[PDB]
Enzyme design. Structure first.
Site, PDB file in Angstrom:
ATOM      1  N   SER B 173      31.325  39.056  18.565  1.00  0.00           N
ATOM      2  CA  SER B 173      30.810  37.962  19.367  1.00  0.00           C
ATOM      3  C   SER B 173      29.317  38.212  19.543  1.00  0.00           C
ATOM      4  O   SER B 173      28.895  39.351  19.839  1.00  0.00           O
ATOM      5  CB  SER B 173      31.504  37.943  20.731  1.00  0.00           C
ATOM      6  N   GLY B 174      28.523  37.160  19.360  1.00  0.00           N
ATOM      7  CA  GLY B 174      27.086  37.290  19.501  1.00  0.00           C
ATOM      8  C   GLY B 174      26.393  37.822  18.254  1.00  0.00           C
ATOM      9  O   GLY B 174      25.187  38.105  18.286  1.00  0.00           O
ATOM     10  N   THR B 178      27.981  31.918  13.768  1.00  0.00           N
ATOM     11  CA  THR B 178      27.992  30.472  13.925  1.00  0.00           C
ATOM     12  C   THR B 178      26.722  29.848  13.344  1.00  0.00           C
ATOM     13  O   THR B 178      26.778  28.890  12.589  1.00  0.00           O
ATOM     14  CB  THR B 178      28.084  30.077  15.399  1.00  0.00           C
ATOM     15  N   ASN B 220      27.259  36.013  24.175  1.00  0.00           N
ATOM     16  CA  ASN B 220      26.599  34.819  23.610  1.00  0.00           C
ATOM     17  C   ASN B 220      26.502  33.644  24.607  1.00  0.00           C
ATOM     18  O   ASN B 220      27.451  33.336  25.332  1.00  0.00           O
ATOM     19  CB  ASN B 220      27.323  34.271  22.346  1.00  0.00           C
ATOM     20  N   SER B 223      28.826  30.639  22.597  1.00  0.00           N
ATOM     21  CA  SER B 223      29.870  31.245  21.744  1.00  0.00           C
ATOM     22  C   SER B 223      31.040  30.360  21.339  1.00  0.00           C
ATOM     23  O   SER B 223      31.680  29.747  22.185  1.00  0.00           O
ATOM     24  CB  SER B 223      30.431  32.492  22.421  1.00  0.00           C
ATOM     25  N   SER B 224      31.308  30.315  20.037  1.00  0.00           N
ATOM     26  CA  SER B 224      32.393  29.522  19.502  1.00  0.00           C
ATOM     27  C   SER B 224      33.674  30.261  19.791  1.00  0.00           C
ATOM     28  O   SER B 224      33.998  31.226  19.121  1.00  0.00           O
ATOM     29  CB  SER B 224      32.237  29.326  17.989  1.00  0.00           C
ATOM     30  N   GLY B 446      35.692  38.825  14.286  1.00  0.00           N
ATOM     31  CA  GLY B 446      35.990  39.960  13.427  1.00  0.00           C
ATOM     32  C   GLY B 446      36.884  40.982  14.104  1.00  0.00           C
ATOM     33  O   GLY B 446      37.257  40.807  15.257  1.00  0.00           O
ATOM     34  N   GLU B 448      37.799  43.845  16.219  1.00  0.00           N
ATOM     35  CA  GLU B 448      37.116  44.514  17.302  1.00  0.00           C
ATOM     36  C   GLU B 448      38.102  45.319  18.132  1.00  0.00           C
ATOM     37  O   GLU B 448      39.228  44.878  18.380  1.00  0.00           O
ATOM     38  CB  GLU B 448      36.431  43.492  18.196  1.00  0.00           C
TER      39      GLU B 448
END
Ligand SMILES: [Ca+2]
Ligand SMILES: [Mg+2]
Lengths: 155, 801, 144
Positions: B173-174, B178, B220, B223-224, B446, B448
């Site tokens: 994330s971040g 995207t 983010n 964030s999506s 991904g 994590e």
């Protein structure tokens, strides 16, 4: 290794002379140990000489003839660069591949890489070998290698 | 050289001008460091397995295990474009190459098939039209690393080979995946444009999807919260014909809960912005966010997010997409109601263990926007009506049970709504012109690992698991075709190996998820129920399934079992999985809404003619079946630090990502075979020094002689027809064996010269000896003479003539 | 040689201060003081067992001719020094020759050194080996 009484005589010939050039007294200064070996046809490396007794500067240790045989015998077992050895080396500094190289690089290799040679020494070998650098500023190392190997007195 | 390449290539010059050191492959190496991950070091001494070293930086001394030391690449591999050429390819060597290029402003770096992208956290001039013209049709090697090259080559591969293409973008994330996905699209749209526009819609679809699938997280600001698989279709002339989208794992928990410093999906704050006052009534909302409990939990505002602008644009985005006024408003209406749902409170114990409502205001407004009866809604929300065979029953709800059924309703409503949204957008982007081929772009979270990993993390890691297996397989086929192509074919097996055991342990018949689904259709199902059954089937039978071990980092949370993923063994806590899998949702409430009067609401809750895990697994099989019928491409997004600061690299973080990223696993996968390869031509030029006395003066010949001469270990290498293959780290040895010899040979040539000079001065020494001899003998005579008592008299008797 | 042997007679034509055709143990100390100096009554008995027969200028040239024996010519000597002068400047640097003599070959000691350079011809740091050669041999003038 086992020396011919010929070789030893020769060795005595050269040991004689050097003993003289620093005060005749049956002793030779270690700072010349390597130089004596060279006059005999051997091409010791600064490391090879230091590993058998040779010293860094003058006036530290003197050697009898009886201590030169062992020392000389040792240097005879060191590696001696062959034509190919030298050529492949220089070849590495050759971009195009047509046997040429820039005088600067030549002097560069000789005074910066490996156990460096003094600028005064490089200056001296280009004169004796007469390695002439053509128009652009590069030389044919193949020829410079043969002359360094052929020695001062040709055939 | 060129302005457009400022943040692409550094200086061949300024990198050759890196002279504050030579390099000793014998002394220089990497060592573990708590602060910088690894550290440059100068070995000092060694006593078995205890190596001692000095850290160039602080110049101290630490003792490390010889097995923990990692090889260091020479200065000539600084900021390398493709790390698949680095003599030494490892954890530290890769971390360093990434760090270096990043700090220099370069963000794109290859590593074999991978295209690593580090979030710059600042816009760069790299994505201009001008730049685009440069990458058009250029092979990846003949130009600086860039995302545009993964895209372009993808396109040109599609035309050339006539086969679907897939670009998989992953990362935490971040990490900026995207924005990367967007870039890929902006690119394909600017190299294959028709002749608002179709492209425009693909572009406007963003606003609305972001309004419902994005939120503010500590990682983010936009964030999506859902994975997206976007396919771009082309015509026989290579032009964009159309596109469609597919979403994955939308984070519904967000709809009713926000962590501190976090918001719910942007849409909620847009509808409460008062950017379109005229809609305030059609939704029955008051322009204040901190007013509704389903969104006023974390924080309410965002610095770079203008909730008032964004809403206006969103409104327009719908228009540009062709949404009907009745539809758009229906969307807003359904959205606004969720706000009111969280605002319904209930009175508990009059003299019973069953709840009651506390006002309708809220339940009436919900009923209004949803087109149903508030009496009906609340009567069903309070005491249900289940569906028991041949004689359906009535259930009694609790204070807890009722508030948790409302959140379920909102959660369930939002999801349905979002799926209808994506399906609607698709409906727009579907210009009936049944295309030729396509190129899909994946964009999911991904792999994590956290301190506390739950059902959500399982779903994520489980997906990437299948996804990583897809890569290993791709790398496998690629390697085979290479070896066979060089007549050096060989044994092999397949990289989708230890990956299947783990995958089966999860998606197969009596596996984890399967037990989760089976264990749900049972009412009285406990957490330790799911546990009990889980353990029984795999505990003590599966190697990939074990018991919690010694905690790895500070703050590990509870854990019921460990799973050996390709990225490591992840401790999971199955607490809540049962509730998180199925969406308890008033079968009764559903029926009412099914009969709602609002077209959107009716369609959102229409019955046929369910569980999360069963849905994802099915949509994942589709995804994978699709992917395996395309030509892959991989974009590994990486986040350098937790501060959004440009140029700042945090080793412990990048390394972590590389471990789960796929790069490290892609390197190990390629290690089995013969990584580093050189085409004979190069081999001779570079290693003839290792065997001069064996060289005649062909190509493979020389090489076959150098290797044989070096008494090369048959295993170490292999002989292709155009290039020679070598095991990992072998060339490294050949490299050092090259430095020693070239050095000795130079030294030897230097000695031959020293020997030439002297021998030349020899004859002179032989002469100068007798010469000096004469002088000393003679000078001593005249000195004795002048001192002889007879001479002074013999010659002081001279003075006449 | 030819005329030294003839000039000897004519310079042994003074060493005859009592003129007998022979000279004598005392006879010398009368030809010396008559100019300064004075070799002792014993700087003669170790300096008289020097004649393979009685003394008298024909038995004087077999005493001067024989400790004088062992020398080299002028060209030989100025060609010796001319082995450390490739440029052929006819001169050697002072410190260089001093170093050659004092630390190489049969080294000179601070004494021989001091004695050799007392009357050494040295102009501006340059040692004239050609001139110095004449000195040692006699062709020019020699000094202590
Ligand atoms: Ca000596
Ligand atoms: Mg008389």
């Amino acid at each position: 290794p086992k020396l011919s009484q010929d070789e030893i005589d020769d060795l005595k010939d050269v040991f004689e002379l050097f003993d003289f050039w620093d005060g005749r007294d049956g002793a030779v200064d270690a700072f010349k140990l390597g130089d004596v070996c060279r006059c005999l046809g051997i091409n010791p490396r600064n490391e090879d000489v230091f590993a058998v007794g040779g010293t860094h500067k003058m006036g530290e240790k003197s050697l009898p003839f009886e201590e030169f045989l062992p020392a000389y015998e040792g240097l005879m077992d060191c590696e001696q660069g062959t034509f190919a050895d030298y050529m492949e080396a220089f070849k590495t500094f050759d971009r195009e591949g047509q046997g040429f190289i820039s005088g600067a690089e030549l002097r560069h290799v000789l005074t910066a890489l490996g156990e460096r040679l003094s600028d005064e020494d490089v200056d001296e070998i280009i004169k004796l070998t007469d390695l002439q650098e053509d128009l652009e500023g590069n030389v044919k190392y193949e020829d410079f290698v043969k002359k360094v190997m052929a020695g001062p007195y040709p055939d | 050289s060129d302005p457009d390449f400022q943040y692409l290539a550094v200086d061949r010059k300024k990198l050759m001008k890196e002279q504050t050191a030579a390099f000793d492959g014998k002394k220089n190496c990497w060592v573990p460091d708590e602060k910088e991950g690894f550290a440059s070091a100068e070995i000092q001494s060694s006593k078995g397995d205890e190596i001692t070293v000095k850290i160039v930086a602080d110049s101290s001394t630490r003792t490390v295990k010889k097995d923990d030391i990692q090889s260091m690449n020479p200065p000539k591999f600084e900021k390398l474009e493709d790390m698949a050429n680095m003599t030494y390819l490892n954890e530290a060597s890769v971390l360093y190459n990434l760090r270096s290029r990043y700090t220099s402003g370069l963000i794109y770096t290859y590593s074999g098939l991978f295209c690593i992208a580090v979030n710059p956290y600042r816009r760069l001039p790299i994505y201009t039209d001008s730049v685009i013209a440069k990458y058009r049709g250029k092979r990846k090697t003949e130009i600086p690393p860039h995302l545009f090259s993964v895209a372009d080559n993808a396109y040109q591969n599609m035309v050339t080979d006539r086969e679907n293409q897939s670009c998989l973008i992953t990362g935490e994330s971040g990490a900026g995946k995207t924005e990367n996905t967007k870039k890929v699209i902006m690119y394909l749209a600017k190299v294959a444009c028709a002749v608002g526009s179709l492209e425009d819609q693909i572009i406007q679809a963003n606003p609305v999807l972001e309004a419902y699938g994005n939120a503010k997280t500590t990682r983010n600001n936009n964030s999506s919260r859902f994975g997206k698989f976007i396919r771009i279709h082309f015509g026989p002339t290579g032009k964009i014909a159309g596109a469609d989208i597919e979403t994955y794992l939308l984070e519904k928990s967000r709809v009713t809960y926000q962590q501190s410093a976090e918001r719910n999906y942007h849409i909620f704050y847009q509808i409460c912005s008062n950017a379109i006052p005229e809609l305030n009534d059609v939704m029955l909302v008051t322009p204040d966010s901190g007013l509704y409990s389903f969104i006023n939990q974390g924080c309410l505002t965002v610095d770079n997010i203008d909730d008032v602008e964004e809403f206006k644009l969103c409104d327009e985005a719908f228009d540009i997409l062709g949404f009907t006024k009745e539809e758009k408003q229906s969307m807003f209406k359904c959205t606004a109601s969720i706000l009111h749902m969280g605002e319904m409170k209930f009175k508990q114990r009059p003299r019973e263990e069953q709840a009651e409502s506390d006002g309708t205001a809220e339940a009436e407004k919900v009923a209004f926007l949803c087109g149903i009866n508030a009496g009906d809604l609340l009567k069903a929300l309070l005491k249900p009506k289940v569906k028991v065979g041949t004689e359906m029953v009535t259930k009694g709800q609790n204070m807890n049970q009722v508030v948790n059924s409302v959140g379920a309703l909102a959660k369930s409503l939002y999801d349905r709504m979002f799926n209808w949204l994506v399906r609607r957008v698709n409906k727009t982007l579907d210009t009936k012109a049944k295309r030729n081929y396509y190129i899909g772009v994946l964009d999911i979270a991904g792999f994590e690992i956290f301190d506390f990993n739950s059902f959500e993390q399982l779903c994520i890691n489980y997906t990437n698991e299948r996804l990583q297996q897809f890569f290993n397989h791709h790398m496998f086929i690629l390697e085979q075709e290479e070896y066979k192509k060089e007549g050096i074919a060989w044994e092999f097996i397949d990289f989708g190996m230890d990956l299947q055991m783990c995958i089966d342990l999860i998606e197969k018949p009596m596996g984890i998820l399967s037990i989760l689904e089976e264990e749900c259709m049972f009412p009285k199902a406990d957490d330790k129920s799911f546990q009990d059954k889980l353990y029984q089937n795999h505990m003590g039978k599966n190697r990939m399934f074990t018991k919690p071990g010694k905690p790895t980092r500070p703050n590990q949370g509870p854990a019921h079992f460990e799973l050996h993923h390709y990225a490591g063994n992840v401790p999971y806590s199955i607490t809540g999985w049962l509730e998180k899998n199925k969406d308890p949702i008033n079968e009764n409430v559903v029926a009412l809404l099914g009969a709602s009067k609002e077209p959107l609401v009716a369609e959102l809750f229409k019955a046929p003619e369910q569980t999360i895990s069963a849905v994802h697994r099915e949509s994942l099989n589709k995804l994978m079946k699709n992917l395996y019928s395309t030509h892959p491409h991989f974009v590994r997004c990486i986040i350098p630090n937790e501060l959004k600061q440009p140029g700042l690299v945090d080793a412990e973080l990048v390394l972590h990502q590389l471990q789960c990223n796929g790069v490290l696993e892609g390197i190990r996968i390629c290690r089995k075979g013969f990584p580093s390869r050189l085409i004979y031509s190069e081999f001779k030029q570079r290693y003839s020094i290792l065997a001069p006395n064996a060289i005649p003066q062909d190509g493979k010949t020389v090489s076959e002689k150098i290797l044989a001469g070096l008494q090369m270990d048959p295993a170490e290498y292999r002989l292709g027809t155009t290039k020679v293959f070598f095991k990992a780290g072998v060339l490294g040895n050949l490299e050092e064996m090259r430095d020693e010899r070239l050095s000795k040979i130079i030294s030897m040539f230097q000695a031959h010269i020293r020997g030439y000079l002297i021998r030349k001065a020899y004859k002179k020494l032989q002469d100068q000896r007798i010469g000096l001899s004469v002088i000393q003998r003679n000078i001593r005579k005249w000195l004795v003479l002048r001192n002889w008592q007879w001479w002074k008299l013999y010659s002081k008797v001279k003075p006449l003539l | 040689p030819q005329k030294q042997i003839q000039e000897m007679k004519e310079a042994f034509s003074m060493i005859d201060v009592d003129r007998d055709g022979f000279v004598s143990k005392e006879d010398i100390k009368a030809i010396s003081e008559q100019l300064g100096r004075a070799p002792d009554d014993k700087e003669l008995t170790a300096m008289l067992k020097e004649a393979p027969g009685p003394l008298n200028f024909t038995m004087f040239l077999s005493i001067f001719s024989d400790k004088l024996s062992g020398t080299d010519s002028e060209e030989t000597i100025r060609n010796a020094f001319a082995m450390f002068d490739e440029q052929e400047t006819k001169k050697l640097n002072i410190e260089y020759i001093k170093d050659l003599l004092e630390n190489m070959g049969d080294n000179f000691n601070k004494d021989e050194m001091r004695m050799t350079f007392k009357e050494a011809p040295v102009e501006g740091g340059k040692f004239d080996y050609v001139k110095f050669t004449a000195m040692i041999k006699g062709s020019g003038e020699e000094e202590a």
